[PDB]
Write an enzyme that holds these catalytic residues in place. Structure first.
Site, PDB file in Angstrom:
ATOM      1  N   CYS A   1      -9.321   8.162 -10.231  1.00 30.69           N
ATOM      2  CA  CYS A   1     -10.486   9.003  -9.971  1.00 30.69           C
ATOM      3  C   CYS A   1     -10.037  10.403  -9.814  1.00 30.69           C
ATOM      4  CB  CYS A   1     -11.276   8.555  -8.746  1.00 30.69           C
ATOM      5  SG  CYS A   1     -12.799   9.505  -8.486  1.00 30.69           S
TER       6      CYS A   1
ATOM      7  N   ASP B   1       0.802  -1.206   0.000  1.00 31.41           N
ATOM      8  CA  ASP B   1       0.000   0.000   0.000  1.00 31.41           C
ATOM      9  C   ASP B   1       0.854   1.283   0.000  1.00 31.41           C
ATOM     10  OD1 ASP B   1      -2.132   1.853   0.191  1.00 31.41           O
ATOM     11  OD2 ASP B   1      -2.543   1.401   2.308  1.00 31.41           O
TER      12      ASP B   1
ATOM     13  N   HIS C   1     -33.110 -15.559  14.805  1.00 31.35           N
ATOM     14  CA  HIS C   1     -34.543 -15.829  14.859  1.00 31.35           C
ATOM     15  C   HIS C   1     -34.975 -15.550  16.330  1.00 31.35           C
ATOM     16  CE1 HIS C   1     -33.383 -19.198  17.350  1.00 31.35           C
ATOM     17  NE2 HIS C   1     -32.310 -19.246  16.552  1.00 31.35           N
TER      18      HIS C   1
ATOM     19  N   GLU D   1     -28.308 -22.892  10.179  1.00 33.14           N
ATOM     20  CA  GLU D   1     -27.370 -23.047  11.289  1.00 33.14           C
ATOM     21  C   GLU D   1     -26.335 -24.135  11.035  1.00 33.14           C
ATOM     22  OE1 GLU D   1     -25.670 -21.653  13.164  1.00 33.14           O
ATOM     23  OE2 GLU D   1     -26.162 -21.753  15.294  1.00 33.14           O
TER      24      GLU D   1
END
Ligand SMILES: O=c1[nH]cnc2c1c(-c1ccccc1)cn2-c1ccc(Br)cc1
Ligand SMILES: O=c1[nH]cnc2c1c(-c1ccccc1)cn2-c1ccc(Br)cc1
Ligand SMILES: O=P(O)(O)OC[C@H]1O[C@](O)(CO)[C@@H](O)[C@@H]1O
Ligand SMILES: O=P(O)(O)OC[C@H]1O[C@](O)(CO)[C@@H](O)[C@@H]1O
Lengths: 439, 439
Positions: free
Chosen positions: B149, B119, B248, B317
Site C-alpha cells: 500500500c 512480524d 435476550h 445457547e
C-alpha cells in the site's frame, strides 16, 4: 405484546400474525460471468460451483451459450462455424448469447433464482461490456471468473476427457474431434483480451484462476457469496482420488428399530467392521484419510481398520430432539402430528429441540470443503448424514435428499470423472436390518 | 473386541486402554512471514490473525523483531538507528531477528505451538532466503503475507493511529514522531524487493494483500490453515463501525434458575426489550444489522426494535443435553459427578448428549466471519454464546472464556480501535436476576 408462535414444520418463532380484514402479502441477484478460451475448464467450474451453491441453499443455474447454439443450429459440422469471418454464424452465436441472457433475466427476476452462471468464452471486452450493461440495467451484480491455462497437456486432457465425447463430435473419431477442437480454439485466440484488474478491469469484481488453481488474482470481492465462491475455488482440485462413504456397522438401536442414541455395534456390525478392513486393504490405496462421527458405532467400525482416524462432531447423526431413542411406532403413537408433518416435508421438518436435513447441510458444509481439499477419504457416518453428503456429490435436490438409499454394510465408492461422480456400490456380504423408509 | 470407553470430561469414545505392565506414551508447524515497508499494517495483520487462530484452537504466537530490539537497545533516539549505513545497528537488528527465530524454533518444536507469526519488514530476498533456510532445516512450513500500500493517506493514518503512540516516541510530540517515522520508512525503500510470484517467488506459498484488501495475489496454497488465513484476510476490513452485543431480555427460566429451554420473556425482559429499542434509536446508526438466535427470548427482544432481523441457529445457547431445563441445584443432586467435572474443566466439559464451550467456538466461527465482513451489528444472544464471541473480540483465553461477566439487560458496545476493541458497557436500568457463577 411481543406475541410469537412456533411454525409447525421448521419450528421457527414468528410474530403472531393477526392479519387484518384484508390480508396483504408485500439481496440483489448475481450473474457469474465465465471468461476464457475453450478447453479451459469453464464448464467444469460452472457445474461444480452450481452443485455446491445449490446444496448450501443458494438457487443457482448455468446458462451455457453452446447449448442454445446446439438448439438453434441442428447439426455441428466443423470449426468453420466458429471462424471470425463467418458473418452468419457470428450473428447466430450473438443471438444465442442474447437468448441465454433473456433466460438469465427471467431466472433471477421472475423465478426466485439467486445466481446465474453465464457459461461462455466472453473473451472480448465488447462482450463483457454488453453483459455489464445487461447486469446494471436489471440491478444484477456481476462477478467474473476467468480461467487462464496455456499448458498443452491440460488443454489436450480436457479435449480427451470431455470435448471429444460432446454431442457435436458424435459422428467423429477421437483424432478428428481433437484436430477440429484445436482449430476451434484458434478461432478465439486473436480477439481474446484477458481480464486486466491492473488498468482496464480495475473496478470489476473478479477472480483469475491461473494454471488449474495454482495461483489466483482476486479483485474487489463485494459480498458474502463472492467471498464463499473464492474460498471454494481455492479448495477444489482435479488430482485423481477416491471417496468411500459408508455407515457404521449395524448397532443395537438398529436391531430395536430405535432412532438416534449412541449405541454400540451388534455382532453383525462388528462382522461388517472386519469385512470393511479387508475391503479397504484390497483397495491398495497409498494414503487414506479415515473420518468418523463422535458417536460410538462409527468409532468402533474405524477401530477395526487399524488405521489413524479423525472424529468430527459435524458427522454425528441428525438430532431427533424429543424423539431420540424412540422407535417410529412410538413416535407415531406419542407424537402423531409430528410424525405426519415430517412425512409431508421431510427436508425442512425440524424435530422438537432437534434438527432438520436443512440443519444437517449447514453443519456438513465444513466436511464438504475439507473433502474437496483431500484425496483418498473414507467417511464412516450415519443414514441422514450420508444422504446429505451423497446429495452433494450426486447433485440431488433438497426434495430427493431425505429418500436416498444408503443401506447398512454397503460402501459407496465415488470416483470423480468428467463433470461429476461415478458411483459404485459394494455390499460387504454381512446381514443387517433395513432402516430405509420410502415416502 | 472393539471395546471403547467414554472420557468423563469431553465425552469422547476412546479405545479401552489396558496399558501393559510397562505403560508407554509415544502436522508440520507453520512460520507465517510478514513482508512489507513500515506502516503497512503488518502488526495489525499479525495481531488480528493470531487472535482468530487462537480462538478457533490453533496455538499461535507473534514474534515482533522490533520488541526484541526495544529489549536489546534500551532507549530509541531517531531514524538514524535504521540507516542502511549504520553498521552497528544493522548487526544489532540482525541479532534481534535471529533471537526471534530462536524463540520461533522453541515455540513450534518444544512448546506445542502450531503457528509462529514472524512480524518484521523481511523486505529483502536475502532475509527471506535465510528465513526459508531456517524453516527447511527445522521442518517448518513457510507462508508469506505481504502488505502492499503506497497510498500516503493510509500511511499517515497508520502513523497517527498506532505509530506516534509507540514506546519509541514517548518523549516526542505528534509532529516529530510523524517526521522521524517517514524518514525511518525511507531507510527501507532502496533495498525493498517485493514478492514476485511470477518469476522469483513462484514456488513460495504467499498472499499479497494490495491496497488494504482491495486486491489479492494468492500463490501455491499448500494446506487447510493457509486456505483459512486467506479466506479470513479476504473478509476483514478497517471501515469504522460498532458491534453491540447483548443477551435476550430476562426470561421465565431465568426467574426459576433453570438452564437451557426455550422460555419467553418475563415482564422485566419485555421492559428491557423496550429500553433496548430506545437505546438503539439514540445511537443514530445509518444502517444496523440485527442478529438473533432461533430461541424465542432473543426473537421477542428483537421484535421490540421494529427493525429487520436475521435468526441464526449458530447463536442458540449452549446445549445442556440431559441437564436441559434443570436448575443448578437439581444438576448437583441428580448428576453430582457431572457437576464437579464441569466446575473443574468448564471450557472442555461436554454435557451428556450436549455441548462444551469448545463446541460453541466451532459453531460460532461462521458468525465471527460474518461479523468481520459487516459494519454496524447488534447481536441478541445468550450467556455462553456471548462469552465465546466476547473472548474472540477481547482476546480472552479458553480458560477465562466460561467465566466472562455478561449480565442481563446490559449492552456491550465494541468499537474497533488500533490493535483491538474498546469495550463500553451500557446497563439499560431494568432489574433482572443474576445468572453469573464464579469458579
Ligand atoms: O482443462 C482445464 N483447464 C484449466 N483448469 C481446469 C480444467 C479442468 C477440467 C477438468 C476435467 C475435465 C475438463 C476440464 C478443471 N479446471 C479447474 C479450474 C479451476 C479450478 Br479452482 C479447478 C479446476
Ligand atoms: O496502515 C495500513 N496499511 C495497509 N493495510 C492495512 C493498514 C492497517 C492499519 C489499520 C489500523 C492501524 C494501523 C494499520 C490495516 N491494514 C490491513 C491490511 C490487510 C487487510 Br486484509 C486489512 C487491513
Ligand atoms: O430421516 P430418516 O429416514 O428418519 O433417517 C434418519 C434416522 O436413521 C437412523 O440413522 C437409523 O434409524 C436414525 O439414527 C436417524 O434418526
Ligand atoms: O456456562 P454457564 O455459566 O453454566 O452458563 C450457561 C447457561 O446460562 C444460561 O444462558 C442462563 O442460565 C443457560 O441457558 C445456560 O445453560
Amino acid at each position: 405484546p411481543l406475541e410469537l408462535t412456533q411454525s409447525r414444520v421448521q419450528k421457527i418463532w414468528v410474530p403472531v400474525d393477526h392479519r387484518p380484514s384484508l390480508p396483504r402479502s408485500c439481496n440483489s441477484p448475481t450473474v457469474i460471468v465465465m471468461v476464457g478460451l475453450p478447453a479451459r475448464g469453464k464448464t467444469y467450474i460452472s457445474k461444480k460451483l452450481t452443485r455446491y451453491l445449490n446444496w448450501i441453499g443458494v438457487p443457482t443455474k448455468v446458462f451455457n451459450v453452446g447449448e442454445y447454439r446446439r438448439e438453434a443450429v441442428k447439426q455441428y459440422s466443423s470449426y468453420n462455424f466458429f471462424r471470425p469471418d463467418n458473418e452468419e454464424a457470428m450473428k447466430v452465436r450473438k443471438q444465442c448469447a442474447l437468448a441465454a441472457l433473456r433466460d438469465v433475466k427471467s431466472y433471477l427476476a421472475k423465478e426466485g433464482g439467486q445466481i446465474a452462471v453465464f457459461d461462455a468464452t466472453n473473451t472480448t471486452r465488447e462482450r463483457r461490456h454488453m453483459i455489464l450493461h445487461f447486469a446494471k440495467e436489471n440491478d444484477f451484480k456481476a462477478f467474473f471468473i476467468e480461467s487462464v491455462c496455456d499448458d498443452p497437456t491440460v488443454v489436450a486432457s480436457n479435449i480427451m476427457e470431455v470435448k471429444i465425447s460432446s454431442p457435436d463430435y458424435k459422428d467423429c473419431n477421437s483424432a478428428e474431434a481433437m484436430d477440429d477442437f484445436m482449430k476451434r480454439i484458434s478461432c478465439y485466440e486473436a480477439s481474446y483480451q484477458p481480464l486486466d484488474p491492473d488498468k482496464c478491469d480495475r473496478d470489476l469484481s473478479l477472480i483469475k484462476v491461473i494454471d488449474v488453481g495454482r495461483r489466483f488474482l482476486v479483485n474487489r470481492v463485494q459480498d458474502h457469496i463472492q467471498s464463499r465462491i473464492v474460498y471454494y475455488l481455492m479448495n477444489i482440485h482435479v488430482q485423481p482420488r477416491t471417496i468411500y462413504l459408508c455407515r457404521h456397522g449395524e448397532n443395537e438401536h438398529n436391531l430395536q428399530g430405535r432412532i438416534g442414541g449412541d449405541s454400540g455395534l451388534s455382532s453383525r456390525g462388528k462382522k461388517f467392521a472386519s469385512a470393511l478392513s479387508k475391503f479397504v486393504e484390497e483397495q491398495n490405496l497409498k494414503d487414506l484419510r479415515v473420518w468418523t462421527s463422535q458417536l460410538k458405532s462409527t468409532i468402533q467400525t474405524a477401530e477395526a481398520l487399524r488405521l489413524p482416524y479423525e472424529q468430527w462432531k459435524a458427522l454425528n447423526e441428525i438430532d431427533a430432539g424429543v424423539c431420540e431413542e424412540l422407535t417410529y411406532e412410538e413416535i407415531r403413537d406419542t407424537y402423531p402430528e409430528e410424525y405426519a408433518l415430517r412425512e409431508q416435508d421431510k427436508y425442512y421438518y425440524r424435530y422438537p429441540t432437534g434438527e432438520s436435513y436443512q440443519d444437517l447441510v449447514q453443519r456438513l458444509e465444513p466436511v464438504i470443503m475439507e473433502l474437496e481439499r483431500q484425496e483418498n477419504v473414507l467417511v464412516i457416518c450415519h443414514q441422514a448424514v450420508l444422504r446429505c453428503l451423497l446429495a452433494y456429490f450426486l447433485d440431488k435436490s433438497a426434495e430427493e435428499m431425505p429418500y436416498l438409499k444408503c443401506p447398512l454394510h454397503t460402501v459407496l465408492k465415488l470416483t470423480p470423472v468428467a463433470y461429476g461422480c461415478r458411483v459404485e456400490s459394494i455390499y460387504l456380504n454381512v446381514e443387517s436390518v433395513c432402516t430405509h423408509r420410502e415416502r
